[PDB]
mmCIF file with all atom_site columns, C-alpha atoms in Angstrom:
data_model
loop_
_atom_site.group_PDB
_atom_site.id
_atom_site.type_symbol
_atom_site.label_atom_id
_atom_site.label_alt_id
_atom_site.label_comp_id
_atom_site.label_asym_id
_atom_site.label_entity_id
_atom_site.label_seq_id
_atom_site.pdbx_PDB_ins_code
_atom_site.Cartn_x
_atom_site.Cartn_y
_atom_site.Cartn_z
_atom_site.occupancy
_atom_site.B_iso_or_equiv
_atom_site.pdbx_formal_charge
_atom_site.auth_seq_id
_atom_site.auth_comp_id
_atom_site.auth_asym_id
_atom_site.auth_atom_id
_atom_site.pdbx_PDB_model_num
ATOM 1   C CA . UNK W 1 1   ? -3.610 -5.471  20.657  1.00 25.42 ? 1   UNK W CA 1
ATOM 2   C CA . UNK W 1 2   ? 0.065  -5.851  21.188  1.00 22.78 ? 2   UNK W CA 1
ATOM 3   C CA . UNK W 1 3   ? 1.939  -9.177  20.834  1.00 19.48 ? 3   UNK W CA 1
ATOM 4   C CA . UNK W 1 4   ? 5.489  -8.797  22.251  1.00 18.77 ? 4   UNK W CA 1
ATOM 5   C CA . UNK W 1 5   ? 7.633  -12.004 22.325  1.00 16.73 ? 5   UNK W CA 1
ATOM 6   C CA . UNK W 1 6   ? 9.527  -13.833 25.082  1.00 13.36 ? 6   UNK W CA 1
ATOM 7   C CA . UNK W 1 7   ? 10.651 -16.819 22.991  1.00 13.09 ? 7   UNK W CA 1
ATOM 8   C CA . UNK W 1 8   ? 13.201 -15.513 20.471  1.00 13.04 ? 8   UNK W CA 1
ATOM 9   C CA . UNK W 1 9   ? 15.264 -18.086 18.549  1.00 10.17 ? 9   UNK W CA 1
ATOM 10  C CA . UNK W 1 10  ? 16.694 -17.749 15.008  1.00 12.79 ? 10  UNK W CA 1
ATOM 11  C CA . UNK W 1 11  ? 17.873 -21.443 15.052  1.00 10.63 ? 11  UNK W CA 1
ATOM 12  C CA . UNK W 1 12  ? 21.025 -20.576 13.064  1.00 13.07 ? 12  UNK W CA 1
ATOM 13  C CA . UNK W 1 13  ? 21.801 -24.213 12.098  1.00 13.06 ? 13  UNK W CA 1
ATOM 14  C CA . UNK W 1 14  ? 18.355 -24.526 10.386  1.00 15.84 ? 14  UNK W CA 1
ATOM 15  C CA . UNK W 1 15  ? 17.571 -20.761 9.984   1.00 15.45 ? 15  UNK W CA 1
ATOM 16  C CA . UNK W 1 16  ? 14.170 -20.915 11.689  1.00 16.71 ? 16  UNK W CA 1
ATOM 17  C CA . UNK W 1 17  ? 12.503 -18.046 13.584  1.00 15.05 ? 17  UNK W CA 1
ATOM 18  C CA . UNK W 1 18  ? 10.651 -19.529 16.605  1.00 19.07 ? 18  UNK W CA 1
ATOM 19  C CA . UNK W 1 19  ? 7.977  -17.298 18.248  1.00 23.14 ? 19  UNK W CA 1
ATOM 20  C CA . UNK W 1 20  ? 4.968  -17.869 20.591  1.00 23.63 ? 20  UNK W CA 1
ATOM 21  C CA . UNK W 1 21  ? 1.678  -16.153 19.566  1.00 24.61 ? 21  UNK W CA 1
ATOM 22  C CA . UNK W 1 22  ? -0.012 -15.895 22.956  1.00 22.94 ? 22  UNK W CA 1
ATOM 23  C CA . UNK W 1 23  ? 0.217  -19.533 24.034  1.00 21.72 ? 23  UNK W CA 1
ATOM 24  C CA . UNK W 1 24  ? 0.917  -21.082 20.663  1.00 21.55 ? 24  UNK W CA 1
ATOM 25  C CA . UNK W 1 25  ? 4.491  -21.766 19.539  1.00 24.20 ? 25  UNK W CA 1
ATOM 26  C CA . UNK W 1 26  ? 5.363  -21.570 15.817  1.00 24.48 ? 26  UNK W CA 1
ATOM 27  C CA . UNK W 1 27  ? 8.699  -21.982 13.962  1.00 20.93 ? 27  UNK W CA 1
ATOM 28  C CA . UNK W 1 28  ? 8.933  -20.128 10.630  1.00 21.15 ? 28  UNK W CA 1
ATOM 29  C CA . UNK W 1 29  ? 11.801 -20.392 8.057   1.00 21.47 ? 29  UNK W CA 1
ATOM 30  C CA . UNK W 1 30  ? 14.263 -17.624 7.127   1.00 21.74 ? 30  UNK W CA 1
ATOM 31  C CA . UNK W 1 31  ? 13.507 -17.691 3.351   1.00 21.41 ? 31  UNK W CA 1
ATOM 32  C CA . UNK W 1 32  ? 9.817  -16.933 4.045   1.00 22.31 ? 32  UNK W CA 1
ATOM 33  C CA . UNK W 1 33  ? 10.758 -13.968 6.262   1.00 21.95 ? 33  UNK W CA 1
ATOM 34  C CA . UNK W 1 34  ? 13.222 -12.507 3.700   1.00 23.24 ? 34  UNK W CA 1
ATOM 35  C CA . UNK W 1 35  ? 10.637 -12.322 0.904   1.00 22.88 ? 35  UNK W CA 1
ATOM 36  C CA . UNK W 1 36  ? 7.825  -11.214 3.324   1.00 25.62 ? 36  UNK W CA 1
ATOM 37  C CA . UNK W 1 37  ? 10.075 -8.222  4.344   1.00 27.68 ? 37  UNK W CA 1
ATOM 38  C CA . UNK W 1 38  ? 8.175  -4.895  3.891   1.00 25.77 ? 38  UNK W CA 1
ATOM 39  C CA . UNK W 1 39  ? 11.111 -2.484  4.249   1.00 25.80 ? 39  UNK W CA 1
ATOM 40  C CA . UNK W 1 40  ? 10.135 0.594   6.268   1.00 23.32 ? 40  UNK W CA 1
ATOM 41  C CA . UNK W 1 41  ? 13.100 2.995   5.814   1.00 20.38 ? 41  UNK W CA 1
ATOM 42  C CA . UNK W 1 42  ? 12.386 3.231   2.056   1.00 17.92 ? 42  UNK W CA 1
ATOM 43  C CA . UNK W 1 43  ? 10.632 6.584   2.640   1.00 18.86 ? 43  UNK W CA 1
ATOM 44  C CA . UNK W 1 44  ? 9.695  7.232   -1.016  1.00 14.88 ? 44  UNK W CA 1
ATOM 45  C CA . UNK W 1 45  ? 8.631  3.892   -2.591  1.00 14.69 ? 45  UNK W CA 1
ATOM 46  C CA . UNK W 1 46  ? 6.492  0.808   -1.782  1.00 15.53 ? 46  UNK W CA 1
ATOM 47  C CA . UNK W 1 47  ? 5.897  -1.437  -4.828  1.00 11.31 ? 47  UNK W CA 1
ATOM 48  C CA . UNK W 1 48  ? 4.995  -5.125  -4.394  1.00 8.13  ? 48  UNK W CA 1
ATOM 49  C CA . UNK W 1 49  ? 7.850  -6.834  -6.284  1.00 5.32  ? 49  UNK W CA 1
ATOM 50  C CA . UNK W 1 50  ? 8.488  -10.567 -6.364  1.00 8.24  ? 50  UNK W CA 1
ATOM 51  C CA . UNK W 1 51  ? 11.607 -11.601 -4.453  1.00 8.61  ? 51  UNK W CA 1
ATOM 52  C CA . UNK W 1 52  ? 13.203 -14.708 -6.038  1.00 6.02  ? 52  UNK W CA 1
ATOM 53  C CA . UNK W 1 53  ? 16.669 -16.346 -6.262  1.00 7.07  ? 53  UNK W CA 1
ATOM 54  C CA . UNK W 1 54  ? 16.691 -16.090 -2.429  1.00 3.62  ? 54  UNK W CA 1
ATOM 55  C CA . UNK W 1 55  ? 16.037 -19.694 -1.242  1.00 3.06  ? 55  UNK W CA 1
ATOM 56  C CA . UNK W 1 56  ? 19.508 -20.437 0.151   1.00 2.23  ? 56  UNK W CA 1
ATOM 57  C CA . UNK W 1 57  ? 19.439 -17.393 2.481   1.00 2.00  ? 57  UNK W CA 1
ATOM 58  C CA . UNK W 1 58  ? 19.888 -17.796 6.171   1.00 3.79  ? 58  UNK W CA 1
ATOM 59  C CA . UNK W 1 59  ? 19.355 -15.696 9.281   1.00 7.49  ? 59  UNK W CA 1
ATOM 60  C CA . UNK W 1 60  ? 22.645 -14.291 10.627  1.00 11.82 ? 60  UNK W CA 1
ATOM 61  C CA . UNK W 1 61  ? 21.485 -12.134 13.544  1.00 9.88  ? 61  UNK W CA 1
ATOM 62  C CA . UNK W 1 62  ? 18.640 -10.586 15.538  1.00 9.05  ? 62  UNK W CA 1
ATOM 63  C CA . UNK W 1 63  ? 18.437 -7.920  18.297  1.00 12.94 ? 63  UNK W CA 1
ATOM 64  C CA . UNK W 1 64  ? 15.442 -5.795  19.512  1.00 11.78 ? 64  UNK W CA 1
ATOM 65  C CA . UNK W 1 65  ? 15.402 -2.409  17.709  1.00 10.52 ? 65  UNK W CA 1
ATOM 66  C CA . UNK W 1 66  ? 14.164 -0.586  20.828  1.00 9.00  ? 66  UNK W CA 1
ATOM 67  C CA . UNK W 1 67  ? 10.667 -1.402  22.117  1.00 10.17 ? 67  UNK W CA 1
ATOM 68  C CA . UNK W 1 68  ? 8.402  -1.657  19.031  1.00 11.67 ? 68  UNK W CA 1
ATOM 69  C CA . UNK W 1 69  ? 10.279 -3.622  16.302  1.00 17.07 ? 69  UNK W CA 1
ATOM 70  C CA . UNK W 1 70  ? 12.908 -6.381  16.089  1.00 17.64 ? 70  UNK W CA 1
ATOM 71  C CA . UNK W 1 71  ? 16.094 -5.728  14.031  1.00 17.97 ? 71  UNK W CA 1
ATOM 72  C CA . UNK W 1 72  ? 16.534 -8.747  11.724  1.00 19.89 ? 72  UNK W CA 1
ATOM 73  C CA . UNK W 1 73  ? 19.639 -9.529  9.633   1.00 21.35 ? 73  UNK W CA 1
ATOM 74  C CA . UNK W 1 74  ? 19.589 -11.843 6.574   1.00 19.70 ? 74  UNK W CA 1
ATOM 75  C CA . UNK W 1 75  ? 22.692 -13.324 4.943   1.00 20.43 ? 75  UNK W CA 1
ATOM 76  C CA . UNK W 1 76  ? 21.204 -12.835 1.466   1.00 20.08 ? 76  UNK W CA 1
ATOM 77  C CA . UNK W 1 77  ? 19.624 -9.475  2.438   1.00 20.31 ? 77  UNK W CA 1
ATOM 78  C CA . UNK W 1 78  ? 20.404 -5.796  3.179   1.00 21.23 ? 78  UNK W CA 1
ATOM 79  C CA . UNK W 1 79  ? 19.561 -5.618  6.951   1.00 24.84 ? 79  UNK W CA 1
ATOM 80  C CA . UNK W 1 80  ? 17.150 -2.652  6.746   1.00 28.86 ? 80  UNK W CA 1
ATOM 81  C CA . UNK W 1 81  ? 13.438 -2.216  7.403   1.00 31.55 ? 81  UNK W CA 1
ATOM 82  C CA . UNK W 1 82  ? 11.205 -2.388  10.480  1.00 30.53 ? 82  UNK W CA 1
ATOM 83  C CA . UNK W 1 83  ? 9.230  -5.546  11.302  1.00 29.96 ? 83  UNK W CA 1
ATOM 84  C CA . UNK W 1 84  ? 7.211  -3.984  14.188  1.00 30.11 ? 84  UNK W CA 1
ATOM 85  C CA . UNK W 1 85  ? 5.888  -6.430  16.849  1.00 28.54 ? 85  UNK W CA 1
ATOM 86  C CA . UNK W 1 86  ? 2.249  -6.983  15.843  1.00 31.11 ? 86  UNK W CA 1
ATOM 87  C CA . UNK W 1 87  ? 3.203  -7.656  12.193  1.00 32.94 ? 87  UNK W CA 1
ATOM 88  C CA . UNK W 1 88  ? 5.827  -10.257 13.327  1.00 36.02 ? 88  UNK W CA 1
ATOM 89  C CA . UNK W 1 89  ? 3.159  -12.207 15.216  1.00 34.52 ? 89  UNK W CA 1
ATOM 90  C CA . UNK W 1 90  ? 0.635  -11.702 12.410  1.00 31.23 ? 90  UNK W CA 1
ATOM 91  C CA . UNK W 1 91  ? 3.146  -13.451 10.070  1.00 34.52 ? 91  UNK W CA 1
ATOM 92  C CA . UNK W 1 92  ? 3.826  -16.067 12.815  1.00 34.45 ? 92  UNK W CA 1
ATOM 93  C CA . UNK W 1 93  ? 0.213  -17.376 12.521  1.00 34.85 ? 93  UNK W CA 1
ATOM 94  C CA . UNK W 1 94  ? -0.125 -16.788 8.699   1.00 35.41 ? 94  UNK W CA 1
ATOM 95  C CA . UNK W 1 95  ? 3.121  -18.095 7.121   1.00 40.32 ? 95  UNK W CA 1
ATOM 96  C CA . UNK W 1 96  ? 1.774  -21.263 5.420   1.00 38.78 ? 96  UNK W CA 1
ATOM 97  C CA . UNK W 1 97  ? -1.109 -19.431 3.687   1.00 41.90 ? 97  UNK W CA 1
ATOM 98  C CA . UNK W 1 98  ? 1.227  -16.577 2.617   1.00 39.13 ? 98  UNK W CA 1
ATOM 99  C CA . UNK W 1 99  ? 3.782  -19.205 1.498   1.00 41.45 ? 99  UNK W CA 1
ATOM 100 C CA . UNK W 1 100 ? 1.268  -21.123 -0.655  1.00 45.69 ? 100 UNK W CA 1
ATOM 101 C CA . UNK W 1 101 ? 0.334  -17.706 -2.144  1.00 46.11 ? 101 UNK W CA 1
ATOM 102 C CA . UNK W 1 102 ? 4.017  -16.693 -2.750  1.00 45.81 ? 102 UNK W CA 1
ATOM 103 C CA . UNK W 1 103 ? 4.625  -20.125 -4.380  1.00 44.94 ? 103 UNK W CA 1
ATOM 104 C CA . UNK W 1 104 ? 2.050  -19.421 -7.114  1.00 43.79 ? 104 UNK W CA 1
ATOM 105 C CA . UNK W 1 105 ? 3.730  -16.045 -7.776  1.00 41.21 ? 105 UNK W CA 1
ATOM 106 C CA . UNK W 1 106 ? 7.179  -17.687 -8.214  1.00 40.27 ? 106 UNK W CA 1
ATOM 107 C CA . UNK W 1 107 ? 5.576  -20.505 -10.271 1.00 39.79 ? 107 UNK W CA 1
ATOM 108 C CA . UNK W 1 108 ? 4.144  -18.174 -12.896 1.00 36.48 ? 108 UNK W CA 1
ATOM 109 C CA . UNK W 1 109 ? 6.595  -15.209 -12.857 1.00 36.66 ? 109 UNK W CA 1
ATOM 110 C CA . UNK W 1 110 ? 9.084  -17.557 -14.607 1.00 39.89 ? 110 UNK W CA 1
ATOM 111 C CA . UNK W 1 111 ? 11.590 -17.160 -11.745 1.00 38.30 ? 111 UNK W CA 1
ATOM 112 C CA . UNK W 1 112 ? 12.483 -19.457 -8.862  1.00 38.48 ? 112 UNK W CA 1
ATOM 113 C CA . UNK W 1 113 ? 13.318 -19.489 -5.173  1.00 38.84 ? 113 UNK W CA 1
ATOM 114 C CA . UNK W 1 114 ? 16.360 -21.544 -6.072  1.00 42.40 ? 114 UNK W CA 1
ATOM 115 C CA . UNK W 1 115 ? 19.208 -19.534 -7.638  1.00 39.60 ? 115 UNK W CA 1
ATOM 116 C CA . UNK W 1 116 ? 19.412 -22.143 -10.435 1.00 40.90 ? 116 UNK W CA 1
ATOM 117 C CA . UNK W 1 117 ? 16.090 -24.051 -10.709 1.00 40.24 ? 117 UNK W CA 1
ATOM 118 C CA . UNK W 1 118 ? 14.913 -26.105 -13.756 1.00 39.06 ? 118 UNK W CA 1
ATOM 119 C CA . UNK W 1 119 ? 11.191 -25.866 -14.600 1.00 43.00 ? 119 UNK W CA 1
ATOM 120 C CA . UNK W 1 120 ? 11.027 -28.807 -17.083 1.00 43.67 ? 120 UNK W CA 1
ATOM 121 C CA . UNK W 1 121 ? 7.321  -29.713 -16.936 1.00 46.19 ? 121 UNK W CA 1
ATOM 122 C CA . UNK W 1 122 ? 4.799  -28.723 -19.590 1.00 44.54 ? 122 UNK W CA 1
ATOM 123 C CA . UNK W 1 123 ? 1.328  -28.393 -18.000 1.00 45.02 ? 123 UNK W CA 1
ATOM 124 C CA . UNK W 1 124 ? 0.214  -25.080 -19.606 1.00 46.72 ? 124 UNK W CA 1
#
């Protein structure tokens, strides 16, 4: 279709993107959106690489990049890439499942969200 927002909030005190998919109003965190950032002005590469040591990011700013994508700035980022519209809303209704998925990646890659985490279990 198209899904173009009217609620835009980055909630800078809590770094939360709020959006409204059709009727339904969701509020996603900044650290999810940094790692789920398919850069789009790469123009030569596109590997899936795990993005870790990024937990304490926040959102710093947000303005519409024309009519088809939303320019998004991240404190612990590089403020480049397109997010489109329909991909933003796709994420808006998917985050938890994608998060649970990205957790298992971080769990087993022997890295962490946290810049200085301490995996001190033994379960495998």
